[PDB]
Amino acid sequence: KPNPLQDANLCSRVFFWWLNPLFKIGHKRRLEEDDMYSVLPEDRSQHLGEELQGFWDKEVLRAENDAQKPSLTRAIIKCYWKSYLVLGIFTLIEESAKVIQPIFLGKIINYFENYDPMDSVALNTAYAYATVLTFCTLILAILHHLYFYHVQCAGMRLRVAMCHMIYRKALRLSNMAMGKTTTGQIVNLLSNDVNKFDQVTVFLHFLWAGPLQAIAVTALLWMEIGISCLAGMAVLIILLPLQSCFGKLFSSLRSKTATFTDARIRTMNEVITGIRIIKMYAWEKSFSNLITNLRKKEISKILRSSCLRGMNLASFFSASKIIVFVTFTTYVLLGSVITASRVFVAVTLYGAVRLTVTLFFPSAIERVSEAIVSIRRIQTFLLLDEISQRNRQLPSDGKKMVHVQDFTAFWDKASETPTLQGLSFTVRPGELLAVVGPVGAGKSSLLSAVLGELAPSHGLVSVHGRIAYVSQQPWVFSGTLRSNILFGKKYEKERYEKVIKACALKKDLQLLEDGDLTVIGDRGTTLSGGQKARVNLARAVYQDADIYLLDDPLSAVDAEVSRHLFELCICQILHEKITILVTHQLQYLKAASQILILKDGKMVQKGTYTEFLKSGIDFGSLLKKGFQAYKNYFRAGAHWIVFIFLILLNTAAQVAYVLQDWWLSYWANKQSMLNTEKLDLNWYLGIYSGLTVATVLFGIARSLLVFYVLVNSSQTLHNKMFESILKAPVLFFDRNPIGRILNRFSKDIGHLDDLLPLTFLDFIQTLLQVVGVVSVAVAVIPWIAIPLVPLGIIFIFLRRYFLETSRDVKRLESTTRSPVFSHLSSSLQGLWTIRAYKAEERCQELFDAHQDLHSEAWFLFLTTSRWFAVRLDAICAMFVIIVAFGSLILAKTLDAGQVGLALSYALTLMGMFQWCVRQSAEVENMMISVERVIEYTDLEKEAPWEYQKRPPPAWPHEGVIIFDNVNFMYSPGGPLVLKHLTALIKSQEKVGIVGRTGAGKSSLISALFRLSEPEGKIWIDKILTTEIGLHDLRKKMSIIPQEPVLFTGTMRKNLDPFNEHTDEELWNALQEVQLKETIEDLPGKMDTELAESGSNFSVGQRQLVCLARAILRKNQILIIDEATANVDPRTDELIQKKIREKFAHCTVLTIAHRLNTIIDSDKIMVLDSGRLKEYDEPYVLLQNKESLFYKMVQQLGKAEAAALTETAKQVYFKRNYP
């Protein structure tokens, strides 16, 4: 994929003209990784990394020779100074241009100030000055982008060199070093700590041309306006500390909010996850209250933080008005007088130095400080102790031979019992050596000793030859299955097919779409554990090394596959290979050439299978231990009248900003046409102060009102979204995962709250400033409205043309960034596997290739940005040239105040225009959050929680439940689950439900609670369910769900969220389940904060909590759902006995998956894939052998069948026949 930046001119690289084809292509279709351009050779990851590694190695040698610490920063500087110095040359030129062009502005205004319509020599010198002014604007506009590309390319090169060095290290960390750190701190110095180097360079040079300029400018001001410049400059210095009190107080109101935001998101997680239970109990008003309170407590702090950001923006807006006000107040008070060529040079010089001081210099400080933090971090990482290269081998006779003599070693050096005790054994080619022992005996430790991972404290190990290894856990990296198998080696058809047929992957390869060519993710999300183990073993076999080490391969696979692998792949193929095995299944031991027993890290006996048959010690004996989006966004915040007031207040802020400078223009023009007659200073300083105060007050009012209206819009959108997600039916929670639902209450509301009001105000602020600049120019020279129409069509077409490809190349550099992260993670997890084979100088090449495919789309992200910006600066510089020259061809009607004003405003357009365009794109970016929040704002709704026909309070009186021809389905158009159900449940009668798992067993509860309004009729005491609002149906039917949940809060909350009970009642109920005792020993009596669904409680304890809930609610209908699956028998019988002896007069429906619990149920529904088949007493059902109850019982066995039959008969006799 050849790169055109390699073949370009210099005129064609100043203008990024070499990038035109990409845009054309991106304009038609979408861009994918094939359109993208391969990187310049000086920019490949391996080249950069090797260079910086050379410098860092030489410098750590220098330090080790000099006996102190080595510095990474010193190596970075030594490698990159001879090329970050030339960038410094251009930034010196550019900053002197910024300080020079106000001087020629002065000289043009000074041509007007002394006009003579006949003198042509003066006009010619003024044209010369206009030409020099335009050369400065074309050095700041057109050449700053080939520079800035190189400034940013330097940082990309530094980040890529660091990523390479970090990986080269992380591929050789000694095990004791891999212990201290984690595989999270080795992706957190590469996902956020090396991303600093992209940013540092951008402003690095603003540490010596941020002070230097602020001296040059001050010296110039002293030449023009005199000592008064100090006044102005004083104010400008006070914007460095003050802007750093809006920073040590915004982070005090912003880290005080996350402690409410994160509580709210945790509660929303418990609301969304357990939504079936919340609905079924009718509790969502309680969670409404909890999240309403946490959100109100969070908006209070978002509202302080927004008032402070609004004040910060208003201060940055009216700073220039204050600087110039105080300068020319002291200038005119000390006896001087305002002329219009010193005024609009002082204004312009303040503009330049104020932009440097308040934005660039402090950014440079902060980013260099963070980059030094990150360089320290990587400094520490690149010095973790490393594995000694497996050194010179003892010269042997070439035998592929494994021996150990008197080995004894530790994983950590403080242990009491050594990890290994005096190990001394050997293995030859062809000998399928094995070891048998319990877990903790250390067969992993023995294999790690073989692989060099265990450092010998005493003795010796001799391993000679190529080795293949299979880890206890399968390890699959990023790639395809054949890529996994080859592991960098060249493919061979027959050698691959032999291993495939040996590994019985044929069924597994058929399971995937591409056969063997399907792409496997990280940890193998595309495969299963057995499949991953098979792929790893196939890789090991195909690698064809002298030694094989196999660990725990066949414990996690089935019978036939494991047998086939052991015999036809291990026993037969590898009978000509050195073998060492870790096994847990004794059935394979018969094939073992040798077997060793290891226990407490020590030898017991080694010998064949028959010899250990002779020893008489059993193995098992030892084995056992749009635009509607904008309209709907703004309409939430405030009525339309407030939007009209907001428009007026934006306009008055900007009009007053401009009328202050026009006042200095009018003051100057009125001073010049004078006479001694003196100019009335009270009047002029009065209106000048009035205009400065109006600028400041209207900027402050405008910012706070934009912020307030948009934060209130956020608050209204959240309240409406949340109250619409509490009422969405459970279908909406089935279709969408808990991740997607909660992602709009955390992220998107997180943009609406603290980032969309800020950005949307910064855009409006700078847009009105651009309109102020263009309006002063047009109002002075009205003909500028003709050139300015083709400069506003060209802008629109440019921006469409760009954003049609800047958006295809701002995902290409995100969809290609993550494979680097993933490769580092994967090569850390299976690092032992990687190093076991000598094949890591191919994993380095893989990391380079993954890091040359992201520093290939960062290249296009850097240069498409400059393509666009060169053209916006062409537009803006044509505006400045038209103003500066159209003002001299019209010199007869203009005068020095008008020209000064128009032209210093045009000069300030430089950079403002681009910031406005950037922010507009960023607003349109961040409005997707609003589209999504408004999309959950209008979900479907289930029936209302209340109806007109309220139920009588005593209902249900009895609990007589009637089913009249009920059809129930989860979704419209989906399969029916119940088909014309018809039944009568007489009061108090205990009824069981039986059938197949999903034969309609699970939908009786959903139909009875109207979790999906059903078709048919259901009556409770002659009241149809569909005629009463939900919370008057779900309140009156207590349920014991399959897996209970505890909600974060006091145990009094879990038993009475609505405070309908007295603490003595709760104590009584907790005593009924005998759990009262277990509670009054925790710190809080009942107010103990709990974990997520009672991790500090037992499943049986959770069931006790839910059964207490039911006893407390004491409604005369009760439903139990899949009582016990894995409950301990004590708790089993406890729950069961309480269920019967607490609910004597309560109608009960039980839905059980075992027949023991519901054998005594007075009646039993039987379901057949959604059909009511049998409904009668259990003994009557068991009489008929054709009855599905009898058929299902006979599945159980013979003894259990007879016992259950006896139980049914006894119950039948005791109940019906006294």
UniProtKB/Swiss-Prot annotation:
Alphabetic keyword roster: ATP-binding, Cell membrane, Glycoprotein, Lipid transport, Membrane, Nucleotide-binding, Phosphoprotein, Repeat, Translocase, Transmembrane, Transmembrane helix, Transport
Topology of the protein relative to the lipid bilayer: Multi-pass membrane protein
Subcellular location: Basolateral cell membrane; Apical cell membrane
Record InterPro entries: AAA+_ATPase (IPR003593), ABC1_TM_dom (IPR011527), ABC1_TM_sf (IPR036640), ABC_transporter-like_ATP-bd (IPR003439), ABC_transporter-like_CS (IPR017871), ABC_transporter_C-like (IPR050173), ABCC4_TMD1 (IPR030240), ABCC4_TMD2 (IPR047083)
EC number annotated for this UniProt entry: 7.6.2.-, 7.6.2.2, 7.6.2.3
PROSITE patterns (alphabetical): ABC_TM1F, ABC_TRANSPORTER_1, ABC_TRANSPORTER_2
Catalytic activity: ATP + H2O + xenobioticSide 1 = ADP + phosphate + xenobioticSide 2; an S-substituted glutathione(in) + ATP + H2O = an S-substituted glutathione(out) + ADP + phosphate + H(+); 17beta-estradiol 17-O-(beta-D-glucuronate)(in) + ATP + H2O = 17beta-estradiol 17-O-(beta-D-glucuronate)(out) + ADP + phosphate + H(+); dehydroepiandrosterone 3-sulfate(in) + ATP + H2O = dehydroepiandrosterone 3-sulfate(out) + ADP + phosphate + H(+)
Domain ABC transmembrane type-1: 84-369, 643-925
Listed Pfam families: ABC_membrane, ABC_tran
Domain named ABC transporter: residues: 402-625, 961-1194
Gene Ontology cellular-component annotations: apical plasma membrane; basolateral plasma membrane; external side of apical plasma membrane; Golgi apparatus; intracellular membrane-bounded organelle; membrane; nucleolus; plasma membrane
Tissue: Widely expressed, with particularly high levels in prostate, but is barely detectable in liver. sinusoidal membrane of hepatocytes.
Cofactor: Mg(2+)
Glycosylation site residues: N675
Domain of life from the UniProt record: Eukaryota
GO biological process: bile acid and bile salt transport; cAMP transport; cilium assembly; export across plasma membrane; leukotriene transport; platelet degranulation; prostaglandin secretion; prostaglandin transport
Principal subcellular localisation of the protein: membrane
Transmembrane segments: 85-105, 128-148, 199-219, 220-240, 320-340, 343-363, 432-452, 639-659, 691-711, 756-776, 778-798, 874-894, 897-917, 958-978
Post-translational modification: N-glycosylated; leading to substrate-selective effects on its transport activity.
The protein's enzyme class: translocase
Residues the record lists as binding ATP 2: G995, R996, T997, G998, A999, G1000, K1001, S1002
Similarity field: Belongs to the ABC transporter superfamily. ABCC family. Conjugate transporter (TC 3.A.1.208) subfamily.
Its biological purpose: ATP-dependent transporter of the ATP-binding cassette (ABC) family that actively extrudes physiological compounds and xenobiotics from cells. Transports a range of endogenous molecules that have a key role in cellular communication and signaling, including cyclic nucleotides such as cyclic AMP (cAMP) and cyclic GMP (cGMP), bile acids, steroid conjugates, urate, and prostaglandins. Mediates the ATP-dependent efflux of glutathione conjugates such as leukotriene C4 (LTC4) and leukotriene B4 (LTB4) too.
Assembly, per entry: Interacts (via PDZ-binding motif) with SNX27 (via PDZ domain); this interaction accelerates MRP4 internalization.
Protein name listed in UniProt: ATP-binding cassette sub-family C member 4
Organism: Homo sapiens
Organism ancestry: Eukaryota, Metazoa, Chordata, Craniata, Vertebrata
Gene symbol of the encoding locus: ABCC4
